[PDB]
């Protein structure tokens, strides 16, 4: 009566270690990944439904951990800049500088160490206002992190380009994927297929806007753990890109300073041509249409005649109040208030966002490990696809939404929401009419 069957097609929810694969000096060491399958297979499961939950998906946690650990390993061999924690004697840059950019750059000089222990050298360099603090309340200044953390120079040969990786299941596991074009992140998913590896995902880091991800295939999607709870984020995925063009219109020079045997510091040298403010342009008509689509869908949760208003972010550190990104190797902090300034009532041009630049970066919102971004010579221009927003509710007929930042995890759960990891359990039994 009891018949034992091996190879039974059943599974259970499971948490395991995933490995990366890559389709082939990068900060994320993507060369360390397993080469991908040039033609991966996908199997449709007929008559199979499954329950998914993107808010409890541990694939997000592994991606978060791998990214931070790789980032830290990439700085391990790079030169430390601790000899720079000196008193800087410093004044402003006033040569051909545009107003409202005036006061942003400073010309500082100091006594730096050199190749021999017995010698000192006088050097000078330019710094951005956001990287220094005044101590002598020319005036004495110090680098902003000298009383809290070590500063490590990023290696100039290492790229920060967000080259995508694929996550792949180990033997004994499978990754289930949703195909439902309207899936909102939780509950039954009527159309499921299996893959061994995920689509390539770019480890892009941003705050208020998501700059280079996937677009919704059909309708604009609004996803949240609750919607109702004002303590939760709302992730909005666009079904069309919004093009954004960013620039740093200052032709800079770069020079190296030897600070000890085998070690050098890269300093901003001087500026060729006039000094101008960094900025980003967003097409105006596209932005307007894009919000109109978002509002029509937000209203489904708030009421047919509910008014929706957008407002800018709350006060706080640039890292949480501005739109930040790494592009061309520079770290931009842009003012987004021009994008969130409207009230939506029931029934060519551009928006220019001014930006600030910082060289001393606390990359993962951790304290004690500061990275110094060496300057880049020449002029930087970037073009990217805005694919979505992170919004919060500002919380009786009007709702107000504000952009905001969030955990790094929220920028990855937006791509991994369709995937689930299960383990295969091949043994099972059933009654039959046979006996040995």
């Amino acid at each position: 009566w009891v018949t034992v069957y091996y190879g039974v097609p059943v599974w259970k929810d499971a948490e395991t270690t995933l490995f990366c694969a890559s389709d082939a000096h990068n900060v994320w060491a993507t060369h360390a990944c397993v080469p991908t399958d040039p033609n991966p297979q996908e199997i449709h499961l007929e008559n199979v439904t499954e329950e998914f939950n993107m808010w409890k998906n541990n694939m997000v946690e592994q991606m978060h951990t791998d990214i931070i650990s790789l980032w830290d390993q990439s700085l391990k061999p790079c030169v430390k800049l601790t000899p720079l924690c000196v008193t800087l004697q410093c004044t402003n840059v006033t040569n051909n500088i545009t107003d409202d950019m005036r006061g942003e750059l400073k010309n500082c000089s100091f006594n730096m160490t050199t190749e021999l222990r017995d010698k000192k050298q006088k050097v000078y360099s330019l710094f951005y206002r956001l990287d220094v603090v005044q101590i002598n309340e020319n005036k004495e200044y110090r680098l902003i992190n000298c009383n809290t953390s070590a500063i490590t120079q990023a290696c100039p040969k290492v790229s920060f380009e967000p080259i995508p990786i694929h996550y792949c299941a180990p033997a004994g596991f499978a990754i289930l994927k949703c195909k439902d074009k309207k899936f909102n992140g939780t509950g039954p998913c009527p159309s499921v297929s299996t893959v061994q590896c995920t689509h390539g995902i770019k480890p892009v880091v941003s705050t208020q806007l998501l700059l280079n991800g996937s677009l919704a295939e059909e309708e604009v999607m609004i996803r949240s753990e609750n919607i109702t709870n004002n303590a939760k984020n709302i992730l909005v995925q666009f079904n069309t890109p919004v093009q954004i063009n960013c620039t740093r219109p200052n032709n800079n020079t770069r020079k190296s300073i030897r600070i000890g045997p085998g070690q050098a510091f890269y300093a901003t040298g001087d500026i060729i041509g006039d000094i101008r403010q960094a900025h980003c342009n967003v097409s105006k008509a596209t932005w307007n249409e894009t919000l109109g689509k978002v509002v029509k869908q937000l209203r489904k949760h708030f009421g047919n005649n509910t008014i929706i208003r957008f407002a800018n972010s709350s006060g706080g550190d640039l890292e949480v109040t501005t739109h930040s990104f790494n592009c061309g190797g520079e770290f931009f902090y842009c003012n987004t208030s021009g994008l969130f300034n409207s009230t939506w009532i029931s029934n060519n041009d551009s928006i220019t966002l001014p930006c600030r630049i910082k060289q001393i970066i606390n990359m993962w919102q951790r304290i004690g490990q500061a990275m110094y971004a060496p300057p880049i010579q020449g002029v930087i221009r970037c073009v990217s696809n805005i694919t979505g927003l992170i919004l919060t509710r500002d919380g009786s007929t009007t709702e107000t939404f504000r952009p905001g930042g969030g955990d790094m995890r929220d920028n990855w759960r937006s791509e991994l929401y369709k995937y689930k990891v299960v383990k295969i359990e091949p043994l099972g039994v059933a009654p039959t009419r046979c006996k040995r």
Partner: antibody
Amino acid sequence: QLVESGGGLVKPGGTLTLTCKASGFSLSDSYWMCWVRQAPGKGLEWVACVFTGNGKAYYARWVEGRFTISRSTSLNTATLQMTSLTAADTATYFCARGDYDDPLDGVATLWGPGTLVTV
Amino acid sequence: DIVMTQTPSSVSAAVGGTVTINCQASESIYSGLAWYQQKPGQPPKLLIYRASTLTSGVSSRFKGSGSGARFTLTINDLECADAATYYCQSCYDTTIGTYGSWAFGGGTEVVV
């Protein structure tokens, strides 16, 4: 609410473009604009669909690149471009509007009188 | 990629009384079925959606049910109400994950 045009006789190997104009509603909202065809003999089959909210479209397997479906919210119309036509493509073509909301999701509720294409 | 099979191709009745039409999906469509009535000379009219809900352009005379991959339509009383060809339509293509891919079976001619 749906008015079709562009029917007529196609010399075999030629092309023909059909149109369907919306009246009384906007294509700027989330609707599916789809074409089906009814063969002489009353066989009925799906040809293609486009989502007006994005321009995304799906085609029947038998199309194999011979048909292109698109929409324009500024004209408030949708069209179907057919090429490499043969005698077998003779049919009454119809446009219909499917809803994108929870009730009637994917359901064609609005149908226009169709138009005849012969080849 | 969903194929619907409709049977019988020809159904008839004496005037008064009921007939049925069956339709079988090649794969479960999780009840994403619509029924249409096409009289000669017009486009099909929608009678029933999501397997059993009426459009109110049709009376209780047209009833139906089903789930998964198998559905039926019952016409409770035939008063020479029509000489329509009835069609079974899938409104959801599970192989894509959308409502943008439709399939029709052949129709059934009802004679009375």
